[PDB]
Every structure is written in C-alpha cells, then in structure tokens.
Design a binder for this molecule. Sequence first.
Ligand SMILES: [Mg+2]
Length: 272
Amino acid sequence: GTPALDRAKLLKQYRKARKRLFMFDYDGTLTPIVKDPQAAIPSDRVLRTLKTLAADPRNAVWIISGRDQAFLDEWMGHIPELGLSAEHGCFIRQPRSDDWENLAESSDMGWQKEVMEVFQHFTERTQGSFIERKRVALTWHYRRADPEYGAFQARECRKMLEETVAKRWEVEVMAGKANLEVRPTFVNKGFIAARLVQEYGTDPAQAPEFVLCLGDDFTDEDMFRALKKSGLPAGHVFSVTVGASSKQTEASWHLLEPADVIGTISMLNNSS
Ligand SMILES: [Mg+2]
C-alpha cells in the first residue's frame, strides 16, 4: 500500500527545482484502459496538458510506451518538445530532435544466433515446444509439453543461457508462465529510466532536482526500482503508481486514475 500523492509536497519541489524530469507511461496512466486499443487515441485534453508541460524548457517530458513508432509519431510527434520511447525502448526520439534512433541496429545483436541455437537444442528435447521470434526478443514456448517435464527442461535451458549468453551480451533472461524469453536490457523500462537520469551527465550539479515517474502496471515497477538506486536525493524523486491505495508497489505514492494524473499535471501547469 501507498499514501495518496501529496500534491503540496510535489508542488513545492517543482517550484524549487531548476531542471525537472517527467517519465510517463502511456496506456493506463495518461489515458484510460479501453476495450479496443487502436482506440486509446489521446484526447485533446491529454495532448494540451502535455504540450503545456513540455513548453517549459526547465522540463524534460518523456512518453514511454509499447506502442509502435507510427502511433507515437502521429499522435504525439506533433509536439516536438516531447521525448518519445516507442516499441518498449527499441526506438527513441530526444526532445526537440526530429531524429529517431534505432537502438536495435546500434547494439550488438550477435546474441540472437546463440540463443536460437540453445532454443533449437531444447526444442529438439521437448515435444510441444516451439520458438517465437519478435524483432528484438526471442521466446521459447513450452506450454504444450507435460508441465513437469517442461519445467525440467526450462530449468536446464535458463542455466545454459545465464552462464553463457548473458555473460557475453547485454541481454536479460526472463521466465514467463510457460516460456523463456531473451531480450536486450534496453527494452527494460528500468534501464530506460536509469539511462534518462544518466544522460544528464556525471556532474552532480547537473542532475534534475525534480523527477516524476508515473505508471500503472508491473512493467513500470522496474522504473520505480531503478529510481530508488539512482543516487538522487529521495525528496527530489516522486515515483507514483496509478491504482488503488492497497496496491503492492515499489512506488512511494499512488494516484487512483488517469484523470487524477492529468489533474496533477494541470496543477503544475497552473503553478504561476
Ligand atoms: Mg500502462
């Protein structure tokens, strides 16, 4: 459980900070969960609120989303002051830059060949299993094997990956329900968050003195944890989950709904 975000405490640090960093999850945070996600086009109120926040040059405003580059480009990209992270960190656009960077193509992807060979080995041993490739992640699915024998082989596979591949390459080995996924570390929201803080440089006088980090599910927990280990003074950082007061989280605060998130940002926009 967490306390409701203390708006007085938030506003005071906002007013005191010389530079400020905002990291917003999109779906379920800035905009409500909906039945059809091609729905979830952001309202004019969301866009207006973000436009006003990002217009202050003291502010660095980031939108961090699983949504495709095309989506963010079309519905957010017309506000050039927004930093954008699309497809879970694979494509990044710095604020005020018209220049998307492809992190996949600039990183060492040699790990995919090795992971494929390992997965091929256990696929041969595990009837019912198969490999799924996505553009940056590789997944071995084994839901169709006997659960006991499946988990036996998944333990052996993970061990092989962790001791070989994950030592040589900057990747993470993730266990899902009945699958193993390997993916670059740059796809982890906590990696993204830590990197955004690191980009301010080594000069501690140059670190942002206000950080607001907002998200609604388990993928955002990674950001909250990353910020805890960032070395920033605790009173400068507000990690906020969107959800119930009773929600278990690494965040320090909660806001109940996306409307309350937009309402909080609007307060900051009306600070004058
Ligand atoms: Mg979300």
